[PDB]
């Protein structure tokens, strides 16, 4: 049960800290060395590469931005695959798609490495409080074996099914999240235009996850992530790719994509998704 954690971002940092607190964290990896520093200060081994990390643990969790970043971390010249022994389990917790999850699992099995896709919901607040919802695709036996590890980071732990099914469920989640977030921003734009009392607006509206998590920041003009707009943009692209594959029309998701693609183009990709139309 030794875990190595790769990617110490906004979600990754507090997630890895939960695992450390639970006694599971043995090693961390970050592209940018500085973020490993509080882990080194707590005696966590800081790896020189994902391969160096993989050599030393039984489970590798990946919490990195997008699928190409997962590819690099797993399959690059000093990727996980170069240091892993057969039997290692890889758990991808960031967000991509069912097709990516299945390609990761296929490529990994060539090395005798097991794979689960376990993306999460609950944002930065959930990661910090260890109350994340976790939605898991892969072998059902591995789900059960990793449950104590998942319980260290979240609360509602859900087995979705075969590989790819965690990502599926996350893409469904992201559709809801994008539109709930657009729903809020548009509400507030109209409230502001109608000269309404923000304290009262907040009272009446508080309803969705987005409003609960982001309204108090928005009202303060704190535009910081939170969850990065460039990340929602990637998530929605995966959403529309899957919708196209299966001939479902999601014109809401398509508009959300455009709006977030625009925010990225405008140079606000690093702001919270809640900053849409206020940046
Ligand atoms: N924040 C949320 O609300 C939230 C909620 C659920 C899921 N997610 C998903 O979780 C994932 C991470 O989110 P985050 O908010 O933690 O993002 P973030 O704060 O931007 O962190 C991104 C992390 O990925 C690392 N990274 C990126 N590309 C890499 C590469 N090619 N090689 C190695 N490391 C790489 C970054 O390293 P550096 O430190 O060197 O930049 C950083 O540790 C994303 O898939 C996101 O969509 C986010």
d(CA 45, CA 133): 28
Q: What is the C-alpha separation between 120 and 93, in angstroms, rounded?
A: 7
The structure's method of determination equals X-ray
Domain limits of the chain? Answer: 2-159, 161-279
Q: Which helix (H) or strand (E) holds 273?
A: none
71 vs 65: CA distance, rounded Å: 11
Question: Which one from 21, 37, 103, 170 is the annotated catalytic residue?
Answer: 170
Residue 98 CA to chain centroid, in angstroms? 14
Query: How far apart are the C-alpha atoms of 9 and 256, rounded to whole Å?
Result: 24
Contact 260, 235 (CB under 8 A): no
Rg value, the chain, Cα: 19
Q: Which class for 237: exposed (0-12), middle (13-18), buried (19 or more C-beta within 10 A)? A: middle
Tell me the binding residues for NADP(+). Answer: 8, 10-11, 30-32, 35, 65, 69, 95, 226, 228, 231, 234
First to last CA, the chain: 44
Give the CATH class of 161-279.
mainly alpha
Task: Determine the topology of domain 2-159 in CATH.
Answer: Rossmann fold (3.40.50)
The alpha helices in the chain, defined as continuous H runs, are 12-21, 37-40, 50-54, 67-75, 80-83, 98-109, 123-129, 140-145, 147-153, 165-193, 198-205, 209-220, 229-245, 251-263
Per-residue tokens: 89: 């389990």
User: What angle, rounded to 10 degrees, do the helices at 209-220 and 165-193 form?
Assistant: 50
- 234 Cβ partners below 8 Å, 6+ apart? 65, 66, 95
- Which H/E stretch holds residue 66? none
Check if 170 is active-site: yes
Considering only CA atoms, which of 121, 115, 110 is closest in space to residue 162? 115
Ligand 1 atom with least separation from CA of 94: 45
Write the secondary structure of 73-135 as one string of H (helix), E (strand) and C (coil).
HHHCCCCHHHHCCCCCEEEECCCCCHHHHHHHHHHHHCCCCEEEECCEECHHHHHHHCCEEEE
Q: What is the DSSP letter of 250?
A: -
> Rounded to an integer, what distance in angstroms lies between the CA atom of residue 70 and that of residue 20?
22
Q: What is the rounded distance in angstroms from the CA atom of residue 179 to the CA atom of residue 169?
A: 16
Q: Per residue in 141-160, is it b (16+ CB within 10 Å) or e — as a string?
A: ebbeebeebbebbbeebebb
For residues 257 and 174, what is the distance between their CA atoms, to the nearest angstrom? 11
Contact 90, 101 (CB under 8 A): no
Two tokens, residue 194:
């109608």
Is 182 within 8 Å of 240 (Cβ atoms)? Answer: no
* Helix (H/G/I), strand (E/B), else coil: 8: coil
Peptide bond into 231 cis (omega under 30): no
DSSP 222: -
Judge contact between 11 and 30, C-beta under 8 A.
Answer: no
Instruction: Give the C-alpha separation, 121 to 156, whole Å.
Output: 10
What angle (nearest 5°) sits at the alpha carbon of residue 176, between those of residues 173 and 177? 85
- Ligand 1 test: best mutation among 10, 73, 172, most atoms within 8 Å of CB? 10
Query: What is the C-alpha to C-alpha distance for residues 69 and 90, in angstroms, rounded to an integer?
Result: 14
CA distance 47 to 224: 29
Beta bridge partners of 60: 4, 90
């Amino acid at each position: 049960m030794r875990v190595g954690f790769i990617g110490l971002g906004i979600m990754g940092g507090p997630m890895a800290t939960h695992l450390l607190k639970a006694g599971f964290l043995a090693a961390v990896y970050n592209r940018t060395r500085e973020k490993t520093k509080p882990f080194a200060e707590a005696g966590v081994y800081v790896a020189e590469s994902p391969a160096d990390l993989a050599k030393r643990v039984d489970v590798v969790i990946v919490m990195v931005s997008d699928a190409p970043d997962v590819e690099q971390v797993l399959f690059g010249p000093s990727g996980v695959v170069e240091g892993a022994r057969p039997g290692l389990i890889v758990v991808d917790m960031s967000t991509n798609s069912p097709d990516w999850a299945r390609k990761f699992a296929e490529r990994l099995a060539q090395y005798g490495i097991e794979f689960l896709d376990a993306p999460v919901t609950g944002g930065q607040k959930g990661a910090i409080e260890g109350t994340l919802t976790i939605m898991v695709g892969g072998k059902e036996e591995l789900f059960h074996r990793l449950l104590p590890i998942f319980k260290a980071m979240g609360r509602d732990i859900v087995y979705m099914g075969p590989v790819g099914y965690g990502q599926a469920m996350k893409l469904v989640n992201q559709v809801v999240v994008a539109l709930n977030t657009v729903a809020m921003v548009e509400g507030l734009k109209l409230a502001k235009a109608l000269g309404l009392d923000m304290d009262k607006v907040a009272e009446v509206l508080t309803r969705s996850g987005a409003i609960e998590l982001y309204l108090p920041k928005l009202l303060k003009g704190d535009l910081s992530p939170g969850f990065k707009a460039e990340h929602l943009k990637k998530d929605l692209g995966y959403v529309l790719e899957e919708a196209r594959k299966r001939g479902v029309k999601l014109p809401g998701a398509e508009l959300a994509y455009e709006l977030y693609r625009k925010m990225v183009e405008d140079g606000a990709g690093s702001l919270g998704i809640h900053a849409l139309g206020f940046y």
